[PDB]
């Protein structure tokens, strides 16, 4: 009710700069999303489950960029709504529909890639799964159903603002039904909770579970290269029957007794021969047993707790080769690892009999300590898992950054606007420029998805060059 020291306005200087920016986002978004959908359709090596979910993300962005920028550019320059009450209900409906398509396709992509880690065939993304089709139709149907309240609640207001005639397309303050009257109150929170907080929380959860399983496969490949994988029963250096990656079966001289120990451990009648997946499951149990002993060891626990995941694997590698006691004897090098003194620890470890007796394995483990990367064990499967993890990480990072300003501009309008203040009117003039910048940013997601795929996927980088040649 109290008056204000100025009229809510935007500088014409701003209107001309932002419009130029909005023109670039629109042209690059249409080209990037169309070519992205083109290379996924043309190339047959890219016609798989994960890319189909990317195409659903690309269409939702291509749909959003079409109904968001061209109408908010006009709303900026012309400052009026001349499209009738049908477009006033249709435009925000298609908008919230397209946005819901992208956040659910993102969520489905993170879930799909997490389930694919367990199988080498799935993480390569070969073929189209069965329920891929029915999942997309559910994503699009649920997206438009949740966008329905946006359609019915919008209408054209005709009011008098200081003697000026205004056609205002907006969400009507008073609604007939009681549910819709409630939707108009907390709509900005529903947009903030469901179209930003929930997809970021869901993707971050399944991405974390994915890389945790990727970590277990890195260690298995590390120990297979260093120690060796034996899929048939063999005798170790002491004559004891062993299988897999150094897994002792029994100290009995009876091969037949050792075979029954194997059958108990695998849950299968193996006749002395196991599969790689069974050796891996057996190895993952040996790691968990090894970690439990490390955490119960007073000399290895502080070092292990302070190390990152890659370097913890290098320490587990040493325990597999020498045992807890033999590793705890490296009292000085372990101290340097806990103080994060890599290069010094790398130099010190190279003086050991361990380095002198098995130099190839020792060099790899020391490099892992020095660098903290898997560069010493880079192999075919690690690269595939590395490319997958990069793909979904950038797509969710592009999403969170592009939709943060628009979502930020709406959540500070809810908590800082107080209609009783005399000077509150001109902070909306600052929210006016934020809400229009947030429209260019959210539309940049349509353009930044192809750029992200070009940089992290070698196949997308080559397919993009092919389409623009």
């Amino acid at each position: 009710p109290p008056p204000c020291q100025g009229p809510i306005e935007i500088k014409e200087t701003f209107k001309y700069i932002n419009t130029v920016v909005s023109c670039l986002v629109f042209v690059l978004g249409i080209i990037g999303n169309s070519t992205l959908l083109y290379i996924i359709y043309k190339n047959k090596c890219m016609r798989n489950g994960p890319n189909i979910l990317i195409a659903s993300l690309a269409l939702g962005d291509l749909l959003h960029i079409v109904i968001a920028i061209p109408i908010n550019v006009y709303k900026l320059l012309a400052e009026d709504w001349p499209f009738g009450a049908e477009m006033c209900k249709l435009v925000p409906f298609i908008q919230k529909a397209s946005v819901g398509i992208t956040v659910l396709s993102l969520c489905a992509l993170s879930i799909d890639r997490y389930r694919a880690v367990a199988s080498w065939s799935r993480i390569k993304g070969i073929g189209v799964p069965k329920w891929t089709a029915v999942e997309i139709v559910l994503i699009w149907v649920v997206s438009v159903v949740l966008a329905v309240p946006e359609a019915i609640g919008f209408d054209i207001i005709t009011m008098d603002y200081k003697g000026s005639y205004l056609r205002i397309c907006l969400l009507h303050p008073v609604q007939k039904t009681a549910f819709m009257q409630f939707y108009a109150t907390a709509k900005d929170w529903w947009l903030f909770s469901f179209y930003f907080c929930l997809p970021l929380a869901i993707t971050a959860f399944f991405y974390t579970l994915m890389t945790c399983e990727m970590l277990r496969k890195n260690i298995f490949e590390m120990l297979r290269i260093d120690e060796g994988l034996r899929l048939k029963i063999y005798k170790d250096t002491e004559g004891y029957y062993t299988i897999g990656i150094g897994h002792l079966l029994t100290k009995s001289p009876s091969l037949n007794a050792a075979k029954s120990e194997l059958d108990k451990a695998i849950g299968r009648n193996t006749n002395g021969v196991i599969t790689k997946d069974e050796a891996e499951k057996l190895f993952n149990q040996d790691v968990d047993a090894a970690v439990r002993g490390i955490l119960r060891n007073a000399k290895l626990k502080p070092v292990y707790d302070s190390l990152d995941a890659v370097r913890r694997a290098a320490l587990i590698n040493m325990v597999f080769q020498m045992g807890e006691t033999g590793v705890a004897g490296f009292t000085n090098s372990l101290r340097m690892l806990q103080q994060k003194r890599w290069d010094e620890a790398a130099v010190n470890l190279a003086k050991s009999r361990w380095y002198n007796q098995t130099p190839n394995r020792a060099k790899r483990v020391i490099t892992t300590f020095r660098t903290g990367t898997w560069d010493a064990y880079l192999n075919d499967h690690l690269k595939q898992r590395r490319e997958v993890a990069k793909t979904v990480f950038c797509l969710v990072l592009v999403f969170a950054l592009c939709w943060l300003p628009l979502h930020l501009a709406r959540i500070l309008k809810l908590t800082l606007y107080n209609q009783n203040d005399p000077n509150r009117c001109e902070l909306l003039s600052f929210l006016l420029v934020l809400d229009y910048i947030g429209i260019n940013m959210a539309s940049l997601n349509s353009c930044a998805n192809p750029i992200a795929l070009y940089l992290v996927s070698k196949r997308f980088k080559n397919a993009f060059k092919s389409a623009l040649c």
């Binding site: 925000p92 207001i157 205004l166 709406r410 929210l431 809400d435 429209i439």
Partner: peptide
């Protein structure tokens, strides 16, 4: 809240 409906007149559609 008439300064608010004028805000929605200048604001984007979201």
């Amino acid at each position: 809240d008439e300064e608010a409906v004028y805000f929605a007149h200048l604001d984007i559609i979201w």
